[PDB]
Amino acid sequence: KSRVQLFK
Amino acid sequence: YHEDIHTYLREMEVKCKPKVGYMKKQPDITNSMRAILVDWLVEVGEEYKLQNETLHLAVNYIDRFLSSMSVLRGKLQLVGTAAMLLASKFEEIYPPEVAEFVYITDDTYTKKQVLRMEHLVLKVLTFDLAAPTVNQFLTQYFLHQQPANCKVESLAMFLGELSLIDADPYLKYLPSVIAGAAFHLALYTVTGQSWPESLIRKTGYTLESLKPCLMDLHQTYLKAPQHAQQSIREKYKNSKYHGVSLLNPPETLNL
Amino acid sequence: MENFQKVEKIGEYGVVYKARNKLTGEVVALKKIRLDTEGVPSTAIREISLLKELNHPNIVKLLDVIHTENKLYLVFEFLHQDLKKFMDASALTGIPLPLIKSYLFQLLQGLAFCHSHRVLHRDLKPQNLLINTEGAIKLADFGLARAFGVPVRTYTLWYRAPEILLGCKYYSTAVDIWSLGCIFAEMVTRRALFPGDSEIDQLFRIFRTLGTPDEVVWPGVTSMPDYKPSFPKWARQDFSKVVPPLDEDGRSLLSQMLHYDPNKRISAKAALAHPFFQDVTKPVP
């Protein structure tokens, strides 16, 4: 989905 | 006022152009991180029904802020979120609330952090948020096509969107040149026609002048299905854009 | 913020004060915005980002922005008053016709500068037209202004174009031209041209004054979201009745400047070339 933490 | 508007856009796009090759001066973030951020912004704009111009403006603000400032790995998504919030406030009728952006960042940054980064991005850009984008030049060129084909316009939007993902080599081209290359590529792909003479007179861009960006955009279009970031291809699969991402790119550009 | 000393309050955007520069000494307007919630307001963001791009004599110039962490200060050049108070003061007798012509010329110049750029005022009312002592009128209050490089989607009431009332989908320069025409008629006759109370009463007043638009007058009225067949078919009132003091050229300019069709409505650049403006002086108020 669009809800995601980038560069984990 | 149409020609005056285009002339002002051309004059202002140089002022709003980010420094080329700023990723080299970035100690942490790279081109791939920027591509992932732009892809996530495409997903966010699709989720919240944001306009394409909003995402183009957000990408422009990101590029200018990264040209003028340096951020770590964890703050890149915060910078992108603040730029998206600023672009929505500038362009959208009803910008999404700050809580919505905090939500869409998977609660990585609090509302206070998002507001502080919005203030920081506003200060860095010096409130120069009316940056010409590929979308504006593309629409202006659309008013100069006969007959108007919705497939041409949708594919030109798709290609201008694709040009946002890769900083290399699309940060070395002005939005007018990218828009001209996208318009010619769409015309050749769906109609088999070339860059119009009316747009040659209006813009001064001969088909030879757009050739570097045209080759770059053709290479991006051919490798679009195999690209790591695919949110733009999914977005333009919808019947709203006539499924232009389904069309196969032309194999060779007869120039 | 330190160099500006507030001396009085001139408006309640946000509250705008009259401020004196402690170093330069020039007197400026000091409109302030309380940054709490949503961050910098979209209205203020648009006003700052579009006003600093516009540098015209007939446009209130934004010469400084103090963006602090908790408050946002906008510094405009200070002008004596707006067109509303000047209208109110000159109620016993009409504003001089040369002054009306000069004010219309300057307003159209500012509008043509805004429209040659990608700026749409969308809030052209006499309260938004500042006036200086030397005799120059300037556009102000760009909070509702929008950049129309791409078409702008439609969201007071007396100066709303018939398209915005009739369910228009996209804004255009024609709405600003219509607002300027309403302001021109208000200046000439000293009273509001279309004092509507609701979105339908204002439309009915426009229809009473200019006749109910058919398809021949305005191609496409039938296919509008807010157009109903139950609209009385009023006739077009002769322009000598609505604006008696206006001469033939002035009446022609007002008629062209209140056209129902946005495409056929005059533009600021074209209105600046009207024969009504052949003898534009610069009288003082």
Find the largest Cα–Cα distance for chain A.
15
Helix (H) or strand (E) holding B166: none
The closest CB to that of C118, out of B5, B89, B93, belongs to: B5
- Measured CA to CA, the distance from residue C154 to residue C131 in angstroms comes to 29
- Measured CA to CA, the distance from residue B22 to residue C18 in angstroms comes to 43
Looking at the DSSP assignment, which residues form a beta bridge with residue C9? C17
- Measured CA to CA, the distance from residue B135 to residue B156 in angstroms comes to 9
**Angle of helix B150-165 relative to helix B175-190, nearest 10 degrees?**
130
Nearest-neighbour CA in chain B from C75: distance (Å): 14
- Measured CA to CA, the distance from residue C108 to residue C99 in angstroms comes to 14
Looking at the DSSP assignment, which residues form a beta bridge with residue C62? C76
- Measured CA to CA, the distance from residue B87 to residue B102 in angstroms comes to 16
B59 and B23 in one domain?
Answer: yes
Beta-strand pair C71-77/C62-67: antiparallel
| Total domains in the fold of chain B | 2
Nearest-neighbour CA in chain B from C148: distance (Å): 9
Q: Which domain holds residue B229?
A: 134-246
> B150: helix, coil or strand?
helix
Tell me B240's DSSP state. Answer: G
Q: Provide the sign of the torsion angle of the four alpha carbons B29, B30, B31, B32, taken in this order.
A: negative
Q: Do B53 and C150 touch (CB under 8 A)?
A: yes
CB-neighbour burial class of residue C45 (10 A; exposed 0-12, middle 13-18, buried 19+):
buried
DSSP letters, B97-139, are PHHHHHHHTTT-S-HHHHHHHHHHHHHHHTT------HHHHHH
Q: Which of C80, C82, C73 is nearest to C30 (CA)?
A: C73
- Measured CA to CA, the distance from residue C278 to residue C285 in angstroms comes to 20
How many C-beta neighbours within 10 Å does residue C17 have?
Answer: 20
Q: Chains B and C: how many Cβ contacts under 8 Å?
A: 82
In a domain, B218, yes or no: yes
B171 and B144 in one domain?
Answer: yes
B112 and B179 in one domain?
Answer: no
Between the CA of residue C258 and those of C112, C153, C209, C252, what are the distances in Å? 17, 22, 11, 10
Q: Do B36 and A4 touch (CB under 8 A)?
A: no
Helix (H) or strand (E) holding B55: helix B52-68
Task: Please name the residue of chain A whose CA is at the shortest distance from the CA of residue B80.
Answer: A6
Residue whose token pair is 């004054």: C209
Residue type, B89: K
Residue pair C118/B5 in contact by the 8 Å Cβ criterion:
yes
Residue type, B214: L
How many C-beta neighbours within 10 Å does residue C263 have?
Answer: 10
Helix (H) or strand (E) holding B232: helix B231-235
Between the CA of residue B207 and those of B169, B181, B195, B201, what are the distances in Å? 19, 9, 6, 12
Helix (H) or strand (E) holding B209: none
Structure-derived torsion over alpha carbons of residues B86, B92, B96, B97, reported in degrees to the nearest 10: 60
Walk across the sheet containing C129-131 and list its strands.
C81-82, C129-131, C137-139
- Measured CA to CA, the distance from residue B213 to residue B181 in angstroms comes to 6
- Measured CA to CA, the distance from residue B116 to residue B73 in angstroms comes to 18
Q: How far is CA B187 from the centre of its chain?
A: 19
Q: Which of C164, C255, C246 is nearest to C217 (CA)?
A: C255
Residue type, B45: G
Chains B and A touch (3+ CB pairs under 8 A): yes
Q: How far is CA B174 from the centre of its chain?
A: 11
Q: Which of C259, C254, C280, C29 is nearest to C140 (CA)?
A: C29
Residue pair C141/C236 in contact by the 8 Å Cβ criterion:
no
Q: Which of C65, C58, C62 is nearest to C77 (CA)?
A: C62
- Measured CA to CA, the distance from residue B37 to residue A6 in angstroms comes to 7
In a domain, B221, yes or no: yes
What is the Cα gyration radius of chain B? 18
- Measured CA to CA, the distance from residue C67 to residue B118 in angstroms comes to 12
Residue pair C30/C63 in contact by the 8 Å Cβ criterion:
no
- Measured CA to CA, the distance from residue C269 to residue C18 in angstroms comes to 34
- Measured CA to CA, the distance from residue A5 to residue C138 in angstroms comes to 48
Residue B102 — φ and ψ, nearest 5°? -60, -40
Residue pair C62/C49 in contact by the 8 Å Cβ criterion:
no
Residue type, B69: M
B175 and B108 in one domain?
Answer: no
In a domain, B255, yes or no: no
- Measured CA to CA, the distance from residue C283 to residue C285 in angstroms comes to 7
Measured between its terminal Cα atoms, the distance across chain A in Å is: 15
Residue C68 — φ and ψ, nearest 5°? -95, 175
State which of B62, B92, B125 marks the end of a domain. B125
B162 and B120 in one domain?
Answer: no
> B62: helix, coil or strand?
helix
Q: Do B73 and A2 touch (CB under 8 A)?
A: no
CB hemisphere CA count around B191 (13 angstroms):
21
Query: Encoding tokens for residue C75?
Result: 């510094």
CB within 8 Å of chain A, chain B residues 87-116: 103-106, 108
Measured between its terminal Cα atoms, the distance across chain B in Å is: 34
B209 and B183 in one domain?
Answer: yes
Between the CA of residue C157 and those of B7, B58, B193, C211, what are the distances in Å? 34, 33, 48, 19
**B46 CB within 8 Å of a chain C CB:** no
Out of C123, C197, C214, C279, the active site residue is: C123
Q: What is the CATH number of the domain that holds B175?
A: 1.10.472.10
Question: Which residues on chain C are in Cβ contact (under 8 Å) with B153?
Answer: none
> B167: helix, coil or strand?
helix
Between the CA of residue C226 and those of B166, B200, C162, C265, what are the distances in Å? 45, 41, 10, 20
Query: Encoding tokens for residue B221?
Result: 């279009």
Chains C and A touch (3+ CB pairs under 8 A): no
Nearest-neighbour CA in chain B from C240: distance (Å): 32
Query: Encoding tokens for residue C65?
Result: 């922005």
Beta-strand pair C62-67/C16-21: unpaired
The closest CB to that of C67, out of B5, B12, B122, belongs to: B122
B236 and B162 in one domain?
Answer: yes
Residue C67 — φ and ψ, nearest 5°? -100, 95
Give the method of determination.
cryo-EM
Output the CA angle C8-C51-C58, nearest 5 degrees. 80
Residue type, C253: L
State which of B73, B101, B125 marks the end of a domain. B125
Q: Which of C81, C84, C57, C87 is nearest to C132 (CA)?
A: C81
Residue C139 — φ and ψ, nearest 5°? -65, 145
B237 and B159 in one domain?
Answer: yes
Q: Which domain holds residue C243?
A: 81-271
Q: Which of B45, B51, B46, B49 is nearest to B81 (CA)?
A: B45
Q: What is the CATH number of the domain that holds C88?
A: 1.10.510.10
Residue type, C201: D
In a domain, B103, yes or no: yes
- Measured CA to CA, the distance from residue B103 to residue C37 in angstroms comes to 15
CB hemisphere CA count around B116 (13 angstroms):
6
Q: Which residues contact C230 (CB under 8 A, 6 or more apart)?
A: none
Nearest-neighbour CA in chain B from C248: distance (Å): 27
DSSP letters, chain C, are -TTEEEEEEEE----EEEEEESSS--EEE--EEE----SS-HHHHHHHHHHTT---TTB--EEEEEE-SSEEEEEEE--SEEHHHHHHHTTSSPPPHHHHHHHHHHHHHHHHHHHHTT-B-----GGGEEE-TTS-EEE--GGG-B--SSPPBP---TT--HHHHTT-SB--HHHHHHHHHHHHHHHHHSS-S---SSTTHHHHHHHHHH----TTTSTTSTT-TT--S----PPBPPHHHH-TTS-HHHHHHHHHHT-SSTTTS--HHHHTTSGGGTT------
Query: Encoding tokens for residue C170?
Result: 């996209």
Q: How far is CA B98 from the centre of its chain?
A: 23
For the question of residue C214 being annotated catalytic, the response is no
Query: Encoding tokens for residue B251?
Result: 């194999």
Measured between its terminal Cα atoms, the distance across chain C in Å is: 32
How many C-beta neighbours within 10 Å does residue C37 have?
Answer: 10
Residue pair C41/C33 in contact by the 8 Å Cβ criterion:
yes
**A6 CB within 8 Å of a chain B CB:** yes
**Residue ranges of the binding site of C:** 10-16, 31, 77-79, 82, 125-128, 141
Output the CA angle B147-B148-B151, nearest 5 degrees. 125
- Measured CA to CA, the distance from residue C87 to residue C191 in angstroms comes to 9
B103 and B173 in one domain?
Answer: no
State which of B103, B125, B147 marks the end of a domain. B125
**B3 CB within 8 Å of a chain C CB:** no
Q: Which residues contact B240 (CB under 8 A, 6 or more apart)?
A: none
